[PDB]
Design a protein around this ligand. Structure first.
Ligand SMILES: *[C@@H]1O[C@H](CO)[C@@H](O[C@@H]2O[C@H](CO)[C@@H](O)[C@H](O)[C@H]2NC(C)=O)[C@H](O)[C@H]1NC(C)=O
Ligand SMILES: *[C@@H]1O[C@H](CO)[C@@H](O[C@@H]2O[C@H](CO)[C@@H](O)[C@H](O)[C@H]2NC(C)=O)[C@H](O)[C@H]1NC(C)=O
Ligand SMILES: *[C@@H]1O[C@H](CO)[C@@H](O[C@@H]2O[C@H](CO)[C@@H](O)[C@H](O)[C@H]2NC(C)=O)[C@H](O)[C@H]1NC(C)=O
Ligand SMILES: *[C@@H]1O[C@H](CO)[C@@H](O[C@@H]2O[C@H](CO)[C@@H](O)[C@H](O)[C@H]2NC(C)=O)[C@H](O)[C@H]1NC(C)=O
Lengths: 128, 128, 128, 128
């Protein structure tokens, strides 16, 4: 991956991992997300994500977003961040997410959306 | 569109419009977004989005997220909401977004992410 | 209340009401908040809030924030918005909130914070 | 400060410092905040904050919120977090904030609110 391609494997401050396949000339990509965390009474399932990374001004440190479609859940998480190359040539994904729960009724909407951050750095795509 | 398919045209409280093409059996879709608003010294450009709508428990009022990849900008917006069918059979998208700006340096990250909501309802896909 | 003083009674899109007493020359105020909504297995209790409204450039449409300290809950909500005087001289509070739940352990922190908006307009402080 | 009183001095991942005076039996406190960061063409000014920490169930790891009223700015920041005592007896404030800018018109509201996190740990209140 070119410095800051989202392509490859990544881990975050929560221990969550994600895999992002090749990014086409449209900035689009899909991948999978394995969350290390849930408030779920359900088996965590590696879940597909789908996104785009920015390709306006073809910036070395592009911003991006993607949706993760939980397999084990009725919710969705969207993440948006920027890929930064730090002082040591190390790629850092700085992200924020909205985690959308499925609420019963439009009147429960006010409580459906959680927010937070994640910081992702690169994992070896090659195992021992 | 089946009650609550995200497929079709939609408008939001900002006057922004979006078009969402067919949703495959994976919950995936692409579309375009025309924002009625920017803080941009640049021509607003109808911009592509890409997402997934939830299809766990095949719920009549599914949650969803998608990324919009601004053509006129270095930023990304991700939206996540739920499709609700209101008391009158009317589809309401209740959404929250994170709008990610491109900041110069990882140290500017703290200020890169704006948040807000949008409410979307359906526009006629057939013009006069 | 001078056009846009937060002082007085207000209601929001959720049916929630709040009372804000006089704002001192520091921009500070306290008040009470009665939420029309909870996900709580507990009696909703009118709860105290405490805040400040902005008083830099003494702007007619000042921004502000305050904390509500739920009496019936271990959580806190903070709201921040701006007071706008609309096209018809009508005061509109546009706000966003972070609702902080109390989670058991620092490792549960990622899921503790909900976000959303509220829109508040003025209620008669004088009853029939 | 009792393990998890917000009272004392704190620093955050941004280098920002804050001082929080005694917390009364109402959970209320005031203090000052010196941000290490701005997007401001203005002298950063140590700015007052005002808040409450939770005191329902008198939990060792209480949640809390407070408003900072920027002296050098038309904006407000509200923070809400939880005070956690980590595996080593060390107090960690985990927080999220909404930083509210002052926008010109109610129609600019959608872009006024930034969000992010801060992590605060304790500084010596006693200098060398
Ligand atoms: C994320 O990926 C990492 C690396 O592939 C996983 O961590 C490894 O876990 C195995 C056990 O399954 C250990 O033998 C290795 O020592 C670990 N390596 C590293 C670098 O930590 C981790 O389990 C994955 N986390 C997920 C899938 O949530
Ligand atoms: C969103 O779509 C609506 C409907 O297609 C557009 O509103 C129409 O705008 C035309 C002028 O271009 C008028 O003649 C119609 O009377 C309007 N119809 C309605 C139902 O409002 C609107 O311009 C589009 N907004 C965008 C693209 O931002
Ligand atoms: C918010 O305040 C309003 C007005 O004081 C309350 O609405 C009134 O409720 C009473 C019954 O308690 C009715 O008789 C009135 O007709 C209502 N007036 C209006 C203007 O709606 C409302 O109950 C309060 N909501 C709270 C406390 O959550
Ligand atoms: C936050 O407070 C810390 C500690 O009081 C400040 O860091 C000290 O800065 C002085 C110079 O002003 C140095 O001589 C010390 O070595 C630093 N000590 C530590 C522990 O870092 C810091 O300047 C303050 N930051 C603000 C006010 O933004």
């Amino acid at each position: 991956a070119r410095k800051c391609s989202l392509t490859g494997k990544w881990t975050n401050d929560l221990g969550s991992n994600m895999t992002i396949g090749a990014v086409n000339s449209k900035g689009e990509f899909t991948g999978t997300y394995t969350t290390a965390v849930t408030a779920t009474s359900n088996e965590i399932k590696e879940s597909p994500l789908h996104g785009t990374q920015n390709t306006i001004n073809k910036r070395t440190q592009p911003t991006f977003g993607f949706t993760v479609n939980w397999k084990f859940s009725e919710s969705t998480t969207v993440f948006t961040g920027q890929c930064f190359i730090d002082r040591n040539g190390k790629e850092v994904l700085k992200t924020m997410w909205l985690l959308r729960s499925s609420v019963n009724d439009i009147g429960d909407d006010w409580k459906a959306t959680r927010v937070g951050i994640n910081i992702f750095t690169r994992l070896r795509t090659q195992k021992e």
